[PDB]
Amino acid sequence: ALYEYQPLQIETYGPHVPELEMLGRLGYLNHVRAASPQDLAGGYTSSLACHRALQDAFSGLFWQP
Amino acid sequence: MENFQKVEKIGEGTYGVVYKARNKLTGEVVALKKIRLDTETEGVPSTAIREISLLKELNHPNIVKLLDVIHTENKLYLVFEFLHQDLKKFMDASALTGIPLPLIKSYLFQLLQGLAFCHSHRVLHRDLKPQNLLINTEGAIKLADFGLARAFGVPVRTYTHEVVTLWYRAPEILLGCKYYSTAVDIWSLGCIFAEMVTRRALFPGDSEIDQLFRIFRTLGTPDEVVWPGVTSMPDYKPSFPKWARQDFSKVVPPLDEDGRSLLSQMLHYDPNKRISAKAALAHPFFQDVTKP
Amino acid sequence: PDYHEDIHTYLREMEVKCKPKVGYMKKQPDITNSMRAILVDWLVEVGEEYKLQNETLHLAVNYIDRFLSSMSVLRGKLQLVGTAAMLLASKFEEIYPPEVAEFVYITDDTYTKKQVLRMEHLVLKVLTFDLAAPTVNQFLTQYFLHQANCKVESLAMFLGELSLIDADPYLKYLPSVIAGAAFHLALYTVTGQSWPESLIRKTGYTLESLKPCLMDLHQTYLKAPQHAQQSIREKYKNSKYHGVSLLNPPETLN
Amino acid sequence: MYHNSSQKRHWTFSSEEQLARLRADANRKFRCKAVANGDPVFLEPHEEMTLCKYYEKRLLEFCSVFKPAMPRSVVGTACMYFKRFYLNNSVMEYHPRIIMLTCAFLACKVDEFNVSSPQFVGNLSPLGQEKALEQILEYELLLIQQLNFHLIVHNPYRPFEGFLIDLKTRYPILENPEILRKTADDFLNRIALTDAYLLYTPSQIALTAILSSASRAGITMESYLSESLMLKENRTCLSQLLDIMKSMRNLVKKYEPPRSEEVAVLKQKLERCHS
Amino acid sequence: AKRYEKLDFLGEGQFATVYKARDKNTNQIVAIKKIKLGHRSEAKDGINRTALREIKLLQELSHPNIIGLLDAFGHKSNISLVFDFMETDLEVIIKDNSLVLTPSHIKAYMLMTLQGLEYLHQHWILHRDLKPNNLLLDENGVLKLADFGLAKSFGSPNRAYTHQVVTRWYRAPELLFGARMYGVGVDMWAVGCILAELLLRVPFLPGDSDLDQLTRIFETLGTPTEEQWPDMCSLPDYVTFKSFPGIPLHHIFSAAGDDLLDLIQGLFLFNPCARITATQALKMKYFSNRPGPTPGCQLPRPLPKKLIF
């Protein structure tokens, strides 16, 4: 039985968050602090911070206890 | 076994549990280290064997006394004289006011006497850090925690897993030297001397490379003149940045001329040229020592 | 170093307290000198197999001699005593000792792991944790600083190890005397020189004082090829020790 | 993440009636225990609530002056620990001063704000400092146990920043969203005083603060919810969102700060209870 | 508390003592870790920070391939953590030469490791301590990532990162050069090393110091230029090395196929931004190719001379 990839399906109860690779395409990266060359050497990009902030903003927005 | 009453649990290391306990027949308070010989697939830990065997022979005022060893089929008890606190806690508490200079000199004199006694008995402490130096209320300081100690009747190999913490590691160890020597203890003592004087770690590196670069930045990047044979060491790289030594007038401002000369001799790059414990005891820095 | 003389003096003082009882062999109702020789030879072979240092072997032999000096052991438990002594020496001296499983395996599972652990506990109880024993290896290392020929060093080490096999003539000599005699013999064999004056002033041993152990060691060297135990020579045949085992002993010694 | 966190699962309650029931149960339980051990000294639940409000303000003022400067996340975590702990326990069993010091200690440890114990007690007579450290060390595990070992706390600050980024990117109707920041921050602080942390998600709180600040400035962003958040497809969800935001605003409106003299009287009563 | 019957001993160490116990309520075997107090210097810190880290991170995760924290009781002095009982780990399987790791077994182990890691990184958490002895296994052949004592959340620009790196054999080169900001690459590199171990039964890059570890990395894979690592020289602990040529990957792993070689190359890319992620790794053709992974139930389960006197 061969393996087939299936994406994680976790309900966030909120608005959809754009994919990480598209963040600079739609212009989100225009409003975050630029990464230092040291950060890029370590592998830290401003896209990570932008995606984290958006995901936290839209998480559990439509949920009721 | 039943002669001691456990007052409380003091610590819990890699192999044994340490209690503060009381001797029922005498009333003296001791530190009882219990190592359970059960649950061990190899028997007595080799660290405990080396510690007991070396500490039995080291009878000095400035070394923690191993009063008794109780050996049982499944438990092993080590009785030490109890000292309430270590020098690291004392330095943390006495920050922002500073340890008095006479106290620092007396502490260094006592530590040097203890280390010289250890070295003349072919014993290498290998773990000289402020957390392992225990003080009492009478103004005395003792070497403790002989868990990494080794006898060097034959040369001792360097082990990556057993080694002092980063801040007090000597540069020869950082560059991958094959064998230990007595000069690593002197380097650690010099680092502790500087930390006591300036209330902060002399070389507070985050990693091995960072620690090496901090040493290079303070004392200058070594070359074959100041440290012969340095370029042949296993971890030496030709491309190390060439910093210049900054004079000891700023690394340890409060120290005087004799203190600065002693610290510079303790912090020699060359292990062979580094000052010894007894030659350091003969220094003019210790012309006026009195226990406070 | 400035502590070197202090270390030598401490070793000279400490070799007396760690000296095994002389003549304990005839107080043992079961085991004898020949069995001890086989045991020590097997210990040499085991140390070779697991790549242990020579200091570990010297310490193990010292522990065995000290342990047999106050306890009586049946001939079936002698190898267990040797295994426990070697394990203790490995724990004290090696950078990391071999596991107990390897030790019980090297004796083709003659004894269980529990027996090995209990006998190690018994040896520790008998010795009272006094395991930092001066050896011939340490005194030879101390003496080598007064030379610098590597062949002489290897041959002196070979003779010092040969002194371990026999308990009859060598158990009455301190390790310092044996090391001095071995150094003199190696110097005479390779370079033809004698006991250097620096060593006389350092140790206080003249030629006359080293003479008895000197002829004992020379006789041992002469009859080494015919000796029933040969793992020491096989150990020193390697180029790592410069192959000094297959050298030519001096037929005379003046 | 919040959407599958322990805070959502176990520490977000349907209404204020649940919170009142839990606090009344804690008070009555302590009264029963005290009367079983062996009458006008016990504190009613509202008095306990007033004392808890006062000590939360005290914890805020303690964290504001902390050296080195505490990040906002640590302060939010400490305040949430305080609220959760006194949801199920009574002030007359554990003094809120030790409890808030322990909450700050635990928050610093959890949020990776590395400070040693001497630095922590230096922010407080030295003898009182060592006594305080002893009490904090004693009460740390009790506080962890009463939190059900749910230590990660989700705060509204990161959702607020994410909302600001989204507004700058996809809402050009608003010229400069940054001017909305300061006022919104003030509203957030008011939210922190009420019980809204135990009733709503952090994203809801952040959005409520942002839109309240916008409405105070005379700007309407109904289109931002309807269009940018795609809520015109699901009108019911938009309705619930507006009701939740209105409930939060009313909760802020009805909040009454503790009175000084009443707090002093109740402090004397609680000190007598602990004596 | 008092609901567990200790019935074995599983190990000791610098941090915790692990034994095996019975739940006495559901009659299920669990593992209890008692957290030691450490040296007497660290006697006024309260609860251990590593224990708090493990508790707080594991209480917010629930995946088949991540160890579960069943309970976290504790006496007011000693705190104990209760986990599922796992019989072995990957290190035992790697070091055991009696059993043979077929390609399907390796694919299974890698697949479960990557699924757990993808779930982990989706929640903005880095494990930071990946090695074969932290990948536990049970009787049903289910791998679980354990030992979350170094794990930390990433994404926030705060530089709370204070060392706490894995054992140097699996440390990524950007961590060896002292990076303070990083992402998922630090996990992925370690994964590659683990994969290499599974392919050779010995550690891939066994250095004895940070400089020696970097030397071994650059000798095996070639010294990176600025084309493959654009900002490498900006790292705080940067040291210039010789221009080693590097060994071709198919020479190191002679039995590996082309898809496996592509996966290994992706896992060992010097640029941390270009290094593949767990999601990208799971989508590679290696995993969907024949043969499929081994089912969890079928995974493997673990002179001289006598002297006569």
Author numbering:
A (entry chain H): 244 to 308
B (entry chain K): 1 to 292
C (entry chain L): 176 to 322, 325 to 431
D (entry chain I): 1 to 38, 44 to 129, 132 to 282
E (entry chain J): 9 to 310, 340 to 346
Task: Show sentences the authors wrote.
CDKs require cyclin binding for basal activation, but for maximal activity they must also be phosphorylated on a conserved threonine residue (Thr160 in human CDK2) within the activation segment or T-loop of the kinase. In metazoans, this activating phosphorylation is catalysed by the CDK-activating kinase (CAK), itself a CDK-cyclin complex consisting of CDK7, cyclin H, and MAT1 (7–10). The CAK integrates regulation of both CDK activity and transcription, as it also phosphorylates the C-terminal domain (CTD) of the largest subunit of RNA polymerase II (Pol II) as a component of the general transcription factor IIH (TFIIH). Our data reveal that CDK7 and CDK2 interact via a pseudo-symmetrical head-to-head interface composed of two main interaction clusters in the N- and C-terminal lobes of the two kinases.
We present structures of CAK-CDK2-cyclin A2 bound to AMP-PNP and in the nucleotide-free (apo) state and of CAK-CDK2 in the presence of ADP-nitrate or ADP-AlFx at resolutions of 2.4-3.2 Å. The detailed analysis of CDK7-CDK2 interactions presented in the following sections is based on the CAK-CDK2-cyclin A2 structures. The CDK2 T-loop does not contribute meaningfully to the interface, thereby explaining why CDK recognition by the CAK is independent of the substrate’s T-loop sequence. In our structures of the CAK-CDK2-cyclin A2 complex, the CDK2 T-loop adopts a rigid conformation, as indicated by well-defined density, almost identical to that seen in structures of cyclin-bound, unphosphorylated CDK2 (18). The formation of contacts between the CDK2 T-loop and cyclin A (buried surface area 480 Å2) suggests that the T-loop is constrained from readily entering the CDK7 active site by the presence of the cyclin. This may contribute to the lower rate of phosphorylation of cyclin-bound CDK2 compared to CDK2. We identify two possible reasons for the decreased flexibility of the T-loop in the presence of cyclin A2: First, the T-loop forms additional interactions with the cyclin, which are likely to stabilise an extended T-loop conformation, pointing away from the CDK7 active site, and thereby reducing the propensity of the T-loop to sample conformations compatible with active site insertion. In the case of CDK2, a bound cyclin may (i) stabilise the enzyme-substrate complex due to the interaction formed by the CDK7 RxL motif, delaying substrate release and thereby reducing turnover and (ii) restrict the flexibility of the T-loop, thereby slowing the access of the T-loop to the active site.
